[PDB]
Amino acid sequence: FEGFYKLIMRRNSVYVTFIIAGAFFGERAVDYGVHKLWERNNVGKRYEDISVLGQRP
Amino acid sequence: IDAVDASTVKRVANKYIYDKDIAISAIGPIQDLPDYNKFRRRTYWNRY
């Protein structure tokens, strides 16, 4: 808590590391959330939802 | 006084100086004096 907190606002190297970590996780969290809502809005329309998938003849 | 060593000065300076607000009182031909944001920014070093 206080240890990381105090380091972030007192050393710019820790703050830059904090920015990189927040960019990395915040980007993945949004990409995960966007894709979950894309899946909920497109039920039945995915390539893996084709009934005849695998029997061409 | 003797108790104030180099570690003491750095500790006290971090409490009173680092990234702290300042008060400015200027008079005269002071157009070239930097503004509040310039003085405010110069209270920390971003290379550390």
Binding site: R11, S13, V14, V16, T17, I20, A21, A23, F24 | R47, Y48
Partner: peptide
């Protein structure tokens, strides 16, 4: 202030390398 800052930026650079290049699978 000289070694601490050096280790701190060395950590920032290493995290940045892991962030730009994301070799999640090269941990072998």
């Amino acid at each position: 202030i000289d070694i601490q800052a050096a280790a701190g930026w060395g950590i920032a650079a290493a995290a940045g390398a892991i962030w730009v290049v994301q070799p999640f699978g090269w941990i072998k």
